[PDB]
Design a protein around this ligand. Structure first.
Ligand SMILES: CCCCCCCCCCCCCC(=O)OC[C@H](COP(=O)(O)OCC(O)COP(=O)(O)OC[C@@H](COC(=O)CCCCCCCCCCCCC)OC(=O)CCCCCCCCCCCCC)OC(=O)CCCCCCCCCCCCC
Ligand code: BCL
Ligand SMILES: COC(C)(C)C/C=C/C(C)=C/C=C/C(C=O)=C/C=C/C(C)=C/C=C/C=C(C)/C=C/C=C(\C)CC/C=C(C)/C=C/C=C(\C)C(=O)O
Ligand SMILES: COC(C)(C)C/C=C/C(C)=C/C=C/C(C=O)=C/C=C/C(C)=C/C=C/C=C(C)/C=C/C=C(\C)CC/C=C(C)/C=C/C=C(\C)C(=O)O
Ligand SMILES: COC(C)(C)C/C=C/C(C)=C/C=C/C(C=O)=C/C=C/C(C)=C/C=C/C=C(C)/C=C/C=C(\C)CC/C=C(C)/C=C/C=C(\C)C(=O)O
Ligand SMILES: COC(C)(C)C/C=C/C(C)=C/C=C/C(C=O)=C/C=C/C(C)=C/C=C/C=C(C)/C=C/C=C(\C)CC/C=C(C)/C=C/C=C(\C)C(=O)O
Ligand SMILES: COC(C)(C)C/C=C/C(C)=C/C=C/C(C=O)=C/C=C/C(C)=C/C=C/C=C(C)/C=C/C=C(\C)CC/C=C(C)/C=C/C=C(\C)C(=O)O
Ligand SMILES: COC(C)(C)C/C=C/C(C)=C/C=C/C(C=O)=C/C=C/C(C)=C/C=C/C=C(C)/C=C/C=C(\C)CC/C=C(C)/C=C/C=C(\C)C(=O)O
Ligand SMILES: COC(C)(C)C/C=C/C(C)=C/C=C/C(C=O)=C/C=C/C(C)=C/C=C/C=C(C)/C=C/C=C(\C)CC/C=C(C)/C=C/C=C(\C)C(=O)O
Ligand SMILES: COC(C)(C)C/C=C/C(C)=C/C=C/C(C=O)=C/C=C/C(C)=C/C=C/C=C(C)/C=C/C=C(\C)CC/C=C(C)/C=C/C=C(\C)C(=O)O
Ligand SMILES: COC(C)(C)C/C=C/C(C)=C/C=C/C(C=O)=C/C=C/C(C)=C/C=C/C=C(C)/C=C/C=C(\C)CC/C=C(C)/C=C/C=C(\C)C(=O)O
Ligand SMILES: CCCCCCCCCCCCO[C@@H]1O[C@H](CO)[C@@H](O[C@H]2O[C@H](CO)[C@@H](O)[C@H](O)[C@H]2O)[C@H](O)[C@H]1O
Ligand SMILES: CCCCCCCCCCCCO[C@@H]1O[C@H](CO)[C@@H](O[C@H]2O[C@H](CO)[C@@H](O)[C@H](O)[C@H]2O)[C@H](O)[C@H]1O
Lengths: 273, 176, 71, 49, 39, 40, 60, 56, 39, 48, 40, 60, 39, 60, 48, 39, 39, 49, 39, 40, 49, 39
C-alpha cells in the first residue's frame, strides 16, 4: 500500500550497489541490496539470540543473558557455549547496523535528500562499536564487551562504573550527560513551540514563525531561527553519543585509577598549588 | 497518453518509469506537491513574505559580505548560465531565499533557491562567482516561471525547488 | 629539484613542514623527559655511567605476583 | 508409455535421474559398508601388527 | 513480464535444482548418521 | 517446449534400454555379493 | 505449479530462497557446534561409543 | 544454465560472490585458529596423534 | 540488456571458474586431512 | 544415442566431467590409502 | 544455440573413445592392485 | 584473460585489491605478533626447538 | 572507458605484478619456514 | 608502466604515499619502543647478548 | 580431436595447464619427501 | 577464439609437449624405482 | 592531468625516489641488525 | 613454437621469467643450505673456541 | 602563480635552510651523544 | 602493439640460446656439487 | 640482443640495477661476516685485556 | 623511449660494465679463497 501522493516518487536510481536488481519495494519498505543484507544479518543474529536463550537457564524475557567470553580467550573466538555465540551475534549486529545506514543512504539519494540521516545514525553506530570492538580491542580481550540481556547489560554498566570507584567524576561523562539533558530540554521546547502555534486556543488564528520566534527569544534571550533549532537538536543529540563513546573509551584503556583522583591536576595548578 | 509514468513491470512494489522528461513532468526527485495552494505566503501583518529586495528598503547586505549581484553563475557543466540580477528575501525570518538570474545567451530571468548555490571555497575567500552543481546551463532555461515578478506563490516555490532537486539524478541523463 | 614548487604551493608546504617539525620535536622531547635515563631536568648533571639503564632482566620471587589471582 | 516424456526437456530428465542414482548408490554403499563389515575386514588384513 | 511458457521453463529448472540439493543433503545426512547417530 | 510424441517415442527407447542395462549389471553385482556374503 | 512464478517475481523469490537457506544452514551448524555431542571441530575424531550423550541427574 | 545471467548481471554476481567467499573463508579460519585441536599457529607442528581431542 | 549469446559465453567461464575453485579447495582439504584428520 | 549432446556446450561438459573425475579420484585414493595401509608400509620401510 | 546434431554425432565418438580408454587403463590398474593386495 | 578489464574499471579494482591486501597483511602480522610461537620481536632470536609449542593431548 | 588494446597491455602488467608479488611472498615464506616452521 | 600516472593524479598519490609511510614508520617505532627487547631509550646501551629475550618453551 | 580447442584462447589453456602442473608437482614432492624419508637421510648424512 | 586451423596446429604442439613430459617422467620414475622401490 | 611525456618524466623521479628510499632503509636495517639482531 | 610469443611484450616476458628465476634460485639455496649443512661447516671451521 | 624561475630561486633558500637545520641538529646530537649515549 | 610473428621468430632464438646457456651452467654446478657432497 | 633495451629509459635501468647491487652486496657482506668470523677476529687482534 | 641506435650503444657499455664488474669480483674471490677457503 502507498500514501496517496507516493507512487510518483517510486523511481529507479540512487542505489549505491546492485543497480536495478534489488531496486524495488516490499509493502512500505524499500529493499535494495543493503535491504537484503540487513534482513540476512537481522535474521541470523536474532535466531542466534533465540538459541542463546534456549541453551540458557530461562525463557523469561528480562533474565535472558548471552554473555561474552572470559578474558583469558583474549582476541580469539571462544567455544560457542562459552561466549563464542556472543561474538557471532556481535558480527551480525555490526553487519545489520552498517547495512541499515547504507540502506538509508540509498533511500535519501532516491528522494533527492541530503545525507544527514545516515551520518546522524553513524553516531549511534560509533558508540556501539566503541563498546564492543574498540574498547575491548584496546584492552586486549573481547570479554570486555557488554552482555546481550535486557537487565544483565545493566549489571555490566553498574560494575564498569564502580571499576572507577565514582564514575560520575569522569570528565567526558559529565559532558555527555550535559548533552543528553540539554537535548531533552531542547526537544521539549521545540516540540511545544511548533504545536502551540499550530494548535492555538479554540477560536484563535493559526500562529506564525514570528510568534514562535518572539516566544523563543523570551525564553533564551536570543532568536535561534528555524534552521538553527534543527541544527542545535542534531548537534546536541549526536554530540551526546560522541561524548558517550569518548567517556567509555578513556575508562580503562587510558585512565585506570578512580575518576575522582583524575581531578588532582585542577587542585595542583601553579596559581594555587 | 499524458500520464507522466508507467510501471516497470506488473509485480507488486516495482518502480515506475517516467514517460517524458522527468525534470519537466515532475517525477521522482524532480516532483513537487501538485495540489499546493497557489497563493503567496504572508507575514504576521499580512504582507508578502518573500519579495525581491528592491521592494523593501529595510533590507541591505551585511557590511563586509559580498553582494552577489552581477556575479556569474557557473552551472554543473561549468558553463556560465547567467548573472545575478536581484535577491529575494524572507521578511518573516530575514535571509536571502532566492537569487534571481539573468540568463546568459537568453532573454529570460529565472529564480534560483540559495540552498542549491555554493560559493567557491565555501565563501571564505575569492567569492568572484557562484556555483550551481545540480543542473546544466542548458537546463537553466527550463526553470519554472513565476506568474509575476514581485511575488512568488507556495506552488511556485515548490515547483522551482523541485526542479533543482531532480537535477542531481536527472541532469546528466538521456531520459529527457 | 625545483619542480616540486610548481607541483605544490610553497606557502602550504612551508606551513605544513614547519608544523610537522615542531610537532615531532615536542613529541621527542616529552618522550625523553618522561623517560628515566633522559629526564634531564632532574638528572642532567649525572655522569654517563651514573644515568639509569633499563634492566637486562626484571626480578622475581615465586610467591610474589604483581597482579591479584583470578580466572 | 512414451507419452510420459512429451512435456519435458530430456536434459532435465537426465539431470533428475542422474541426481537420484548418485544419491541412492552412495546411500546404499555407506549403509552396506556398515552392515557387511567390509572394508573393515580388508583393513584388518593389511594393518600393521 | 514472463509468459506462462517461460514460467514452465523456469519451473523445470527450479524443481530440478531442488531435487539435486535434496539429494546432496540426503547423502550428507546419511554420512552424518553413520558417523554419529542422533537417535 | 519439451518433446513431441515422435522424439519422445525414441527417447523412451533409450530410457528403457538404459534401465534394463543398469538392472542387468545390478543383478550380476547382487549375484556376486550373495555368493560372497549372503545376508538372509 | 509453475504459475507461482506469475504471482511472484522469480528474480527476488530466488534471493529470498538462497538467503533463507544460508541463514538456516548457518544456524544449524552453530547450534551443533555449541552442543557437546556434535562439537565436531574438537571431538569429531571420537567414535560413537565415545561421543557425549546427555542425561538428567540420576535422581536418587 | 545460462539464462540465469539474463536475470542477474554476471558483472555484479561475480563481485558479490567474491565478497561472500572472502567473509566465509575468514570466519572458518578464525573458528579453527581459536579451537584447541586446530590452533595451528601455536600447535601446528604437533603430530596427529599428539594433537588435542575435545574429550572430557 | 545482455544478449543470450553473451550469457551463454559467460556461463562457460562461470562454470569453469567455479569448478576450478572447487578443485583447488578439494586439494587443500586433501592436504589438511593428511595433516590432521577431523573425523 | 548421440543426440543427448545437442544444445549442450562441449567445454562445459569437459569441465564438469573433468572436475567430477578429480573429486572422485581424490576421494577414492584417500579412502584406499586408509584401507590398504599404503603408503604407510612404504614410509615404514625407509624410516629410521 | 549449442551443439548441432552433426557436432553431437562427432563429439559422441570422442566421448565414447575417451571413456573406453579411461576404463581400459583403470582395468589394468585394478588387475595390478588385485595381484598386489587382494581385497576379498 | 585481459577482457576482464572491460567488465571492471582497473583504476577501481587496484584500489580495492591494495586495500584488501594491506588489511590482510596487517591482520596476519598482528595475529602472529600476538601469538606465543611467533611473537618475533621479543623472541625471534630463539632457535626453532627453543620456540614455544602449544599443549599436546593428555596421555589417556 | 578503456579500449580492448589498453586492456590488453594493462593485463600484462597486472599478471607481471601479481607474479612478482607471489615470488617475493614465496621467498618470504621459505625464509620463515627455515627460521621457525609451523608444521 | 608510467601510464599508471594517467589513472591516478600524482599530486594525490605523493600526499597519500607520504601520509602512509609516516604513519607506518611511527607505528613500527612505537611498537618497538613499547617492547622489552627494543625499548631503546632506556636499554639501548645494553649489548646484544645482554638485551631481553622472550620466554622459551619451558617443558614445565 | 583438435577442434575441442576451437573458440578457446591458447594463452588461457597454457595458463590453466601451467598452474595445474606447478601445483601438482609441488604437492607430489612434499608428499614424496614425507614417504620416502628424503632429504631426511641426506641431512642425516651431513650433520653434527 | 581459435579457428579450426589454429586448433589443428595448436593440438600438434600440445600432444608433443604432453608426450615429452610423460617420457621425462617415465625416466624419473625408473630412476626413483631403482633407487627406492615403493611396492 | 598528466600527458604522456609528463607522466613518463614523473615516473623517472618516482622510481628513483622509491629505490633511493629503500636503499637508505636497507642501510638503516644493516645498522640496526649489527646493533641488536632480531633473529 | 615461436608463434607462442606473438601478441606478448618482450619486457613482460623477461620480467616474468626474471622474477620466477630469482624466486626458484633463492628457494633452492635456502633449502639446500638446510639439507647440506653448508655454510654451517664453514662457520664451524673459522669459529673462535 | 608560481613560475619556474620563482621555483628555482626558492629552491636555493630552501636547500640552505634545510642544510643549516641539519647541521645544527647533528651538532646537537653529537653533544647529546657525548653527554649520555643511547647505544 | 604486441610482438609479430617475424619478431617472435627472432626473440625465440635468443630465448632458446639463453635457456640452453642457463642449463649448461647449472649442469656444471650440479657436477661440482655432486662430487663435493653426493646426495643419494 | 641489444633490442631488449628499446623503449626503456636508461636512467630507470641504471637506477634499478644500482639499487639491486646495493641490496645484494649488503646482504652478501652481513651474511659473509657471519660465516667467515671476520671482522670478529680483527677486533680480537687489537682489543685490550 | 630508447631507440635501436641508442640501444645498440647502450648494450655495448652495459656488457663492458658487467664484464668489468665480474672481473673485479673474480679477483675478490681469488683473494678470499687464498685467505679463507670455504669448501
Ligand atoms: C518502552 C518505551 C519506548 C517504546 C517505544 C515504542 C514506539 C513504537 C513505535 C512503533 C508503533 C507504530 C508501528 C506502526 O504503526 O506500523 C504500521 C502498521 C500498519 O499500519 P499502517 O502503516 O497505518 O498501514 C499499512 C498497512 O495497513 C498496509 O501496508 P502494506 O499492505 O503495504 O504492508 C503489510 C502490512 C502488514 O502489517 C504488518 O506487517 C505489521 C504487523 C506488526 C506491527 C507491529 C507494530 C509494533 C507494535 C508495538 C506496540 C506494542 C506491541 C506489543 O503493514 C506493514 O507492512 C507495516 C510494517 C510496519 C512495521 C513496524 C514495526 C515496528 C516495530 C516496533 C517495535 C517496538 C519495540 C519497543 O501498524 C500496525 O500494524 C498497528 C500498530 C499500531 C500501534 C501499536 C499500538 C498498540 C496498542 C496496544 C495494543 C492494541 C491492540 C488492538
Ligand atoms: C646518473 C644516472 C644513473 C646512474 C649511473 C651510474 C653510473 C654511470 C655508474 C653508476 C655506478 C653505481 N651506481 Mg648509479 N646511477 C643512477 C642511480 C643509482 C641508484 C638509485 C637509488 O637510483 C643506486 C642505488 C645506484 C648505485 C650504484 C652502485 C651500484 C655503483 C657504484 C657507485 C655508487 O655507489 O653510486 C651510488 C649512486 C649515486 C650517489 C647516484 C648516481 C650518480 C653518482 C654520481 C654515482 C655514480 C657515477 C660514478 C661516480 C661514475 C664514475 C666514473 C666511471 C667509473 C667511469 N645508482 C642514476 C639513475 N651509476 C657505477 C658503477 O657501475 O660502478 C660499478 C657507475 O660507473
Ligand atoms: C536448531 O534447529 C532448528 C533450526 C531450530 C530446527 C528447525 C528447522 C526448520 C524449521 C527448518 C525448515 C526447513 C525448510 C522448510 O521448508 C527447508 C526448505 C528448503 C527448501 C525449499 C530448499 C529448496 C532448495 C532449492 C534450490 C537449491 C533450487 C535451485 C535451483 C537452481 C540451481 C536452478 C536455478 C535456475 C536456473 C539455473 C535457470 C533458470 C531458467 C531461466 C531463468 C530461464 O529459462 O528463463
Ligand atoms: C538401506 O535401507 C533402505 C534405503 C530403506 C533400503 C531400501 C531402498 C529402496 C526402497 C530402494 C529403491 C530403489 C529404486 C526404486 O525404484 C530404484 C530405481 C532405479 C532405477 C529406476 C534405475 C534406472 C536407471 C536408468 C538408467 C541408468 C538409464 C539410462 C539411460 C540412458 C543412458 C539413455 C539416455 C537417453 C538418450 C541417450 C536418448 C536421448 C535422445 C534424445 C535427446 C532425442 O531423441 O531427441
Ligand atoms: C563452522 O563454521 C560454519 C561457518 C558454521 C560452517 C558452515 C559453513 C557453511 C554452511 C558453508 C556454506 C558454503 C557454501 C554454500 O553454498 C559455499 C558455496 C561456494 C560457491 C558457490 C563458490 C563458487 C565459486 C566460484 C568462483 C570462484 C568462480 C570464478 C569464476 C571466474 C574466475 C571466471 C570469471 C569470468 C570471466 C573471466 C569471464 C568474463 C568475460 C569475458 C572475459 C569476456 O566476455 O570476454
Ligand atoms: C569408496 O566408497 C564409495 C565412494 C562409496 C565407492 C563407490 C564408488 C562409486 C559408486 C563410483 C562410481 C564411479 C563411476 C560410475 O559409476 C564413474 C564414472 C566414470 C566415467 C564415466 C569416466 C569417463 C571418462 C571419460 C573421459 C576421460 C573422456 C575423455 C574424452 C576426450 C578427451 C575427448 C574430448 C572431446 C572431443 C575431442 C570432441 C571433439 C569434437 C568437437 C568439440 C566438436 O565436433 O564440436
Ligand atoms: C589469521 O589467518 C587468517 C588471516 C584468518 C587466514 C587468512 C584467510 C584468508 C581468507 C586469506 C585470503 C587470501 C587471499 C584471497 O583472495 C589472497 C589473495 C591475494 C591476491 C589476489 C594478490 C594479488 C596481488 C597482485 C598485485 C600485487 C598486483 C600488482 C600489479 C602491478 C604492480 C601493476 C599495476 C599497473 C601498472 C604499474 C600500470 C599498468 C599499465 C597501464 C595502466 C597502462 O599502460 O595504461
Ligand atoms: C599423493 O596422493 C595423491 C595426490 C592422491 C596421488 C594421486 C595423484 C593423481 C591422481 C595425479 C594425476 C595426475 C595427472 C592426471 O591426468 C597428470 C596429468 C599430466 C599431464 C596431462 C601433463 C601434461 C603436460 C603437457 C605439457 C607440458 C605440454 C606443453 C606444451 C607445449 C610446450 C606447447 C605449447 C604450444 C605451442 C608452442 C604452440 C603455440 C601456437 C599457437 C598459439 C598458434 O599457432 O596460434
Ligand atoms: C621515539 O620517538 C619516535 C617519534 C617514536 C621516533 C620516530 C621518529 C620518526 C619516524 C621521525 C621521522 C622524521 C623525519 C621523516 O621524514 C624527518 C624529516 C625532516 C625534514 C624533512 C626536515 C627538513 C627541514 C627543513 C627546513 C627546516 C627548511 C628551512 C627553510 C628555510 C628556513 C628557508 C625559507 C625560505 C626563505 C627564507 C626564502 C624563500 C624564497 C622566497 C620566498 C622567494 O625568493 O621568493
Ligand atoms: C626442494 O623441493 C622442491 C622445491 C619441491 C624441488 C623441486 C623443484 C622443481 C619442481 C623445480 C622446477 C624447475 C624448473 C622447471 O621445471 C625450472 C625452469 C627453469 C627455466 C625454464 C630456466 C630458463 C632460463 C632462461 C634464461 C635465463 C634465458 C635468458 C635469455 C637471454 C640471456 C636472452 C634474452 C635476450 C633477448 C630477449 C633479446 C631478444 C629480443 C628481441 C629479438 C627483440 O626484442 O626484438
Ligand atoms: C648467501 O646466500 C644466497 C643469497 C642465497 C647466495 C646466493 C646468491 C645469488 C644467487 C646471487 C646471484 C647474483 C647475480 C645473478 O645474476 C648477480 C648479477 C649481477 C650483475 C648482473 C651485475 C652487473 C653489473 C653491471 C654494471 C656495474 C654495469 C655498468 C654499466 C655502465 C657503467 C654503463 C652504463 C650506461 C651508459 C654509460 C650509457 C650509454 C649510452 C646512452 C644512455 C645513450 O647513448 O643514450
Ligand atoms: C578460480 C581460480 C581457480 C582456477 C579456475 C579455472 C581453472 C580451469 C581453467 C580451464 C581453462 C579452459 O576452460 C575453458 O576456457 C575457455 C576459453 O579458453 C572458455 O570458453 C568460453 O569463452 C570462449 C571465448 O570467449 C567462448 O568461445 C566459449 O564459448 C566459452 O565457453 C570455456 O568455457 C572454459 O571451459
Ligand atoms: C570431494 C573432495 C574431497 C577431497 C578430500 C577431502 C577429505 C575427505 C576424505 C574422505 C576419505 C577418508 O578416508 C579415510 O581416511 C582415513 C584417514 O584417517 C583412514 O583412516 C585410517 O588410515 C589412516 C592413514 O591413511 C590412519 O592415519 C588412521 O588412523 C586410520 O584410521 C580411513 O581408513 C579412510 O577410510
Amino acid at each position: 500500500a502507498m500514501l496517496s501522493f507516493e507512487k510518483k516518487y517510486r523511481v529507479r536510481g540512487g542505489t549505491l550497489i546492485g543497480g536495478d536488481l534489488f531496486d524495488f519495494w516490499f509493502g512500505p519498505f524499500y529493499v535494495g541490496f543493503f535491504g537484503v543484507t540487513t534482513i540476512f544479518f537481522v535474521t541470523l543474529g536474532t535466531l542466534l539470540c533465540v538459541w542463546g536463550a534456549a541453551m540458557g537457564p530461562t525463557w523469561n524475557l528480562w533474565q535472558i543473558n548471552i554473555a561474552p567470553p572470559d578474558l583469558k580467550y583474549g582476541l580469539g573466538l571462544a567455544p560457542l557455549r562459552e561466549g563464542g555465540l556472543w561474538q557471532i551475534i556481535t558480527l551480525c549486529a555490526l553487519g545489520a547496523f552498517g547495512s541499515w545506514a547504507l540502506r538509508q543512504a540509498e533511500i535519501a539519494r532516491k528522494l533527492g535528500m541530503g545525507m544527514h540521516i545516515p551520518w546522524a545514525y553513524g553516531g549511534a553506530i560509533l558508540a556501539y562499536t566503541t563498546l564492543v570492538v574498540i574498547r575491548p580491542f584496546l584492552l586486549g580481550a573481547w570479554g570486555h564487551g557488554f552482555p546481550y540481556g535486557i537487565f544483565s547489560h545493566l549489571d555490566w554498566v553498574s560494575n564498569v562504573g564502580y571499576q572507577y570507584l565514582h564514575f560520575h567524576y569522569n570528565p567526558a561523562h559529565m559532558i555527555a550527560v550535559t548533552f543528553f539533558f540539554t537535548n531533552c530540554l531542547a526537544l521539549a521546547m521545540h516540540g511545544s513551540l511548533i504545536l502551540s502555534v499550530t494548535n492555538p486556543p479554540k477560536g484563535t488564528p493559526t500562529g506564525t514563525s514570528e510568534q514562535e520566534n518572539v516566544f523563543f527569544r523570551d525564553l533564551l534571550g536570543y532568536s535561534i531561527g528555524a534552521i538553527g533549532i534543527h541544527r542545535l537538536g542534531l548537534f546536541l543529540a549526536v554530540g551526546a553519543a560522541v561524548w558517550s563513546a569518548i567517556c567509555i573509551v578513556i575508562s580503562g584503556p587510558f585512565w585506570t585509577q578512580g575518576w575522582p583522583e583524575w581531578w588532582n591536576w585542577w587542585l595542583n595548578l601553579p596559581i594555587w598549588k | 497518453s499524458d500520464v507522466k509514468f508507467v510501471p516497470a513491470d506488473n509485480y507488486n512494489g516495482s518502480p515506475i518509469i517516467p514517460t517524458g522528461n522527468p525534470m519537466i513532468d515532475g517525477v521522482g526527485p524532480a516532483s513537487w506537491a501538485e495540489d499546493r495552494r497557489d497563493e503567496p505566503d504572508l507575514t504576521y501583518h499580512g504582507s508578502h513574505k518573500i519579495v525581491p529586495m528592491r521592494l523593501d528598503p529595510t533590507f541591505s547586505i551585511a557590511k563586509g559580505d559580498p553582494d552577489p549581484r552581477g556575479l556569474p553563475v557557473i552551472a554543473a557543466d561549468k558553463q556560465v548560465a547567467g548573472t545575478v540580477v536581484e535577491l529575494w528575501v524572507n521578511r518573516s525570518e530575514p535571509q536571502v531565499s532566492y537569487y534571481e538570474v539573468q540568463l546568459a545567451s537568453g532573454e529570460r530571468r529565472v529564480l534560483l533557491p540559495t540552498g542549491y548555490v555554493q560559493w567557491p571555497n565555501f565563501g571564505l575567500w575569492g567569492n568572484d562567482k557562484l556555483l550551481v552543481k545540480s543542473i546544466t546551463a542548458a537546463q537553466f532555461a527550463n526553470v519554472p516561471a513565476t506568474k509575476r515578478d514581485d511575488q512568488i506563490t507556495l506552488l511556485e516555490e515548490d515547483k522551482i525547488c523541485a526542479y533543482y532537486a531532480g537535477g542531481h539524478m536527472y541532469a546528466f541523463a538521456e531520459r529527457s | 629539484m625545483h619542480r616540486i614548487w610548481l607541483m605544490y604551493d610553497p606557502r602550504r608546504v612551508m606551513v605544513a613542514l614547519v608544523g610537522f617539525l615542531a610537532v615531532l620535536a615536542l613529541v621527542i622531547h616529552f618522550v625523553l623527559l618522561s623517560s628515566q635515563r633522559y629526564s634531564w631536568i632532574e638528572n642532567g648533571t649525572l655522569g654517563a655511567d651514573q644515568a639509569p639503564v633499563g634492566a637486562s632482566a626484571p626480578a622475581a620471587a615465586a610467591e610474589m605476583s604483581p597482579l591479584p589471582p583470578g580466572r | 508409455m512414451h507419452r510420459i516424456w512429451m512435456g519435458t526437456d530430456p536434459h532435465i530428465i537426465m539431470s533428475a535421474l542422474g541426481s537420484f542414482l548418485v544419491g541412492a548408490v552412495l546411500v546404499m554403499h555407506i549403509w552396506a559398508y556398515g552392515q557387511f563389515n567390509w572394508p573393515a575386514t580388508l583393513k584388518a588384513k593389511y594393518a600393521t601388527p | 513480464g514472463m509468459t506462462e511458457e517461460e514460467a514452465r521453463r523456469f519451473h523445470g529448472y527450479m524443481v530440478t535444482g531442488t531435487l539435486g540439493y535434496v539429494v546432496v543433503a540426503s547423502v550428507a545426512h546419511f554420512l552424518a548418521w553413520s558417523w554419529r547417530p542422533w537417535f
